[PDB]
Paper text:
Voltage-gated K+ channels of the Kv3 family represent an important subfamily among the 70 different Kv channel genes in the human genome, with specialized biophysical properties to sustain high-frequency firing of action potentials. The combination of ultra-fast activation and deactivation kinetics and high activation potential of these channels are key for their ability to repolarize the membrane and terminate the action potential. Like other pore-forming subunits of Kv channels, Kv3 members are comprised of an N-terminal cytoplasmic T1 domain, which is involved but not required for Zn2+-mediated tetramerization, followed by the voltage-sensing domain (VSD) with transmembrane helices S1–S4 which is connected via a helical linker (S4/S5L) to the pore forming domain (PD) of the channel. Here, we present cryo-EM structures of the human Kv3.1a channel in an activated state, providing mechanistic insights into the modulation of Kv3 channels by the cytoplasmic T1 domain.
To elucidate the structural determinants underlying the biophysical properties of Kv3 channels, we purified the shorter α-isoform of Kv3.1 from mammalian cells and determined cryo-EM structures under different sample conditions (apo, Zn2+-containing vs. Zn2+-free). We achieved 3D reconstructions between 3.1 and 3.5 Å for the different conditions, which show only minor differences in the overall structure, and no clear densities for additional Zn2+ sites other than the known sites in the T1 domain16 (see Supplementary discussion). The polar head group of the lipid is stabilized by interactions with the imidazole group of H212 in the S1/S2 linker and backbone interactions with Q409 and M414 in S6. Our maps also show densities in the selectivity filter which likely correspond to K+ ions from the purification buffer.
Residue numbers in the entry:
A (entry chain C): 7 to 120, 170 to 173
B (entry chain D): 260 to 295, 300 to 463
C (entry chain D): 7 to 87
D (entry chain A): 433 to 463
E (entry chain C): 347 to 432
C-alpha cells in the first residue's frame, strides 16, 4: 500500500506515496492521501489514476517530487511547461536558477512587447 | 578611517583588504605634510605619484554594484583567453612592424644620406605603435604608409588585426554573458522557503 | 537467467546481466550479482527491481553500461543529470 | 563570424581535451 | 553597466595618460606640458572616449613611449569594456 501508479496520458508512472506526500497542497499530495479514489479518476481493475496530460513533462514534475529541485525540460517550449506545472499545482517561481532564464524568456519578451462625424 | 579602525575583527584580512590599502595609500600624502630637505624633494616627487591613486577610491563605492562583481569574476576566470590575446597581439605587432619597416624602404630616395627620410617608419618600435593603432582599427593617422608596398602591408595589417582581435574576444564576451545572466537570475529570484520538506 | 528488468519510475528497462556486470563497483553492478533480491527493492510477481528515479536519464546511464562511453542528454539541465 | 565560430569550437574542444584527466577505461568490455 | 564601465575606464586612462605624457616633458619650458596634447585631465577624458570607442580622430594622440603604452592599453581595454554588455 506504499506504491501508487499514475497513468498520465497512457504512460504508467510509479512511485511511493511518501514521494507524493513530500510537497503538500499540490494535486499529487491529494493523490497520496487515502481519500483519493472518489476525488480523482481511478479504475480498480488496474489500480491506476488516469490524468489526460502530457507524460513527458510529468516525468520532470515527478522528478521535482522525488529529488526536491524543480528543473525545466529543454525539449519543450517555455509556455508548454508553464501551463503543465500550472495544471499540476506546482508554483512556477521554484525552478532552479540553472533553468530560470530560458524558462522565463518568452514571457518576458511577450510582456515587454505589450457625435455622428466624430 | 579612524572609526573603521575602532572595530577591526581579523586584522590580518583587514590589512589584506585592498580597499583599506587604497584608503591608507590615498590618505598618506596629505598626512605627510607635517612629517615633511634633500630627501623631502624626492619624497614629494613620489608623493605626487602616490596621490595619482586618489582616483582609486571610486571602487569603494562601485564594489556594491553587481555588474562590476560579474566583471571581476569574468576577468579572474578568463586568464587563458587574455594570455592568448596578448600573445596574438605581440606576434602580429612584431611581424607587421618588421614588414612595414622593410616595405617603406623599397621606395626610399637614394639621394638622402639617411636610410629613411620621407617615411614615418624610421625604425621598428614606431612600427610597433603603428601596428597596434592599425590592428585595433583605431587609425589615428599620425603615421601611415606612403608607398604601394607599405599600403599592401597596411591592408594586410588591418585585416589580420581584425581577425586576431575577433578570435578570443567572443570567448571572453560569452563568459561574461553567462556570468551576468546567472547573477541577474540569482538576484531577481525571490528568497525561497523550501516548500519541499524532504522525507527522512 | 541472463536477462534483468529494471523498473525505473514505472518504465521497464531490460538488459542482460553481462551489460550491468561490465562496470564494477557501481549500483547496477551490485544489481547484476545473484545476491540482489534482499539488497534491493524487488517483487517476485513481475521479476523487476524498482528504483524511484527519473527514467529518461537512466536510459543514458544504461547506454553508458552498454556501449562504454558516457554522454550527457541535451534535453535535461546539467545539475539534473 | 563563421571563421570566429570555427575557432571557438576548436578552442573549446582543445581546452576540454587538455583539462580532462587521463582516463583509466573503467568500462571493461565484454567478450 | 555600460555607462559605469565607460566612466571608470575614461577616468583611469585619462589620469594614466596625463601622468605618462609628463615623464618625457622637456625641463626647459616653464609650463609642465608644452609638446603634448594632454595638458590636463579633461582632455584625457575626451581622448579616452575617442580611443576606447576605436574612433581615433587623431586630433590628440600620445607622443611618448609611455604614452604609447598607455594608449595601447586604452584601446584594448576599451574594446573589451565596450564588447562586454553590448
Ligand atoms: C586598475 C588596476 C587596479 C584595480 C584594483 C582593483 C580593486 C579591487 O580589488 O576591486 C575589487 C572589486 C570586487 O571585489 P569584491 O570581492 O566584490 O569586494 C570585496 C573586496 N574584497 C573581498 C576583495 C576585499 O571590484 C572589481 O574587481 C572590479 C574589477 C576592476 C577592473 C577594471
Ligand atoms: C590591388 C592590386 C594593387 C597592386 C599595386 C602594385 C603596383 C606596382 C607598381 C610599381 C610602381 C608603382 C609606382 O611607381 O607608383 C605608382 C603609384 C604611386 O605610388 P607611390 O609613388 O609609391 O606613392 C604614392 C603615395 N602618395 C601619392 C599617396 C603620396 O602607385 C599606386 O598608387 C598604387 C597604390 C595602390 C596599392 C594599394 C592596395 C590596397 C590593398 C589592395 C587590395 C587588398 C584586397 C584585400
Ligand atoms: C613592446 C615593448 C616596447 C617597450 C618600449 C620601452 C622603451 C624604453 C626606452 C626608454 C628610452 C626611449 C627613448 O628615449 O626614445 C626612444 C624611442 C623614441 O621615443 P620618444 O623620444 O619618447 O618619442 C617618439 C615620438 N615620435 C618620434 C614618434 C614623435 O622610443 C620609441 O620609439 C619606442 C616606442 C615603442 C613603444 C610602443 C609600444 C606599443 C604597444 C607595445 C606592444 C603592446 C602589445 C599588446
Ligand atoms: K573602428
Ligand atoms: K577608426
Ligand atoms: K583618423
Ligand atoms: Zn511553444
Ligand atoms: Zn536545471
Amino acid at each position: 500500500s506504499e506504491r501508487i501508479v499514475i497513468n498520465v496520458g497512457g504512460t504508467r508512472h510509479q512511485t511511493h506515496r511518501s514521494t507524493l506526500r513530500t510537497l503538500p497542497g499540490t494535486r499529487l499530495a491529494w493523490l497520496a492521501e487515502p481519500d483519493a479514489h472518489s476525488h480523482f479518476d481511478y479504475d480498480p481493475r488496474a489500480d491506476e489514476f488516469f490524468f489526460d496530460r502530457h507524460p513527458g513533462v510529468f516525468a520532470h514534475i515527478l522528478n521535482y517530487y522525488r529529488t526536491g529541485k524543480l528543473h525545466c525540460p529543454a525539449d519543450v517550449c517555455g509556455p508548454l511547461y508553464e501551463e503543465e506545472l500550472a495544471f499540476w499545482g506546482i508554483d512556477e517561481t521554484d525552478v532552479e536558477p540553472c533553468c530560470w532564464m530560458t524558462y522565463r524568456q518568452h514571457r518576458d519578451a511577450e510582456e515587454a512587447l505589450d457625435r455622428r462625424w466624430q | 578611517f579612524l572609526m573603521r579602525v575602532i572595530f577591526c575583527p581579523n586584522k590580518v584580512e583587514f590589512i589584506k583588504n585592498s580597499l583599506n590599502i587604497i584608503d591608507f595609500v590615498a590618505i598618506l600624502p596629505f598626512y605627510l605634510e607635517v612629517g615633511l630637505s634633500k630627501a623631502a624633494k624626492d619624497v614629494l616627487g613620489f608623493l605626487r605619484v602616490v596621490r595619482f591613486v586618489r582616483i582609486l577610491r571610486i571602487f569603494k563605492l562601485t564594489r556594491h554594484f553587481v555588474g562590476l562583481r560579474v566583471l571581476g569574476h569574468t576577468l579572474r576566470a578568463s586568464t587563458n583567453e587574455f594570455l592568448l590575446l596578448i600573445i596574438f597581439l605581440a606576434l602580429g605587432v612584431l611581424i607587421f612592424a618588421t614588414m612595414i619597416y622593410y616595405a617603406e624602404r623599397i621606395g626610399a630616395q637614394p639621394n638622402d644620406p639617411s636610410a629613411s627620410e620621407h617615411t614615418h617608419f624610421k625604425n621598428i618600435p614606431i612600427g610597433f605603435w603603428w601596428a597596434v593603432v592599425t590592428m585595433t582599427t583605431l587609425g589615428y593617422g599620425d603615421m601611415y604608409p606612403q608607398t604601394w608596398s607599405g599600403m599592401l602591408v597596411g591592408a594586410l595589417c588591418a585585416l589580420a588585426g581584425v581577425l586576431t582581435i575577433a578570435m578570443p574576444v567572443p570567448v571572453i564576451v560569452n563568459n561574461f554573458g553567462m556570468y551576468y545572466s546567472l547573477a541577474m537570475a540569482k538576484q531577481k529570484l525571490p528568497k525561497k522557503k523550501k516548500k519541499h520538506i524532504p522525507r527522512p
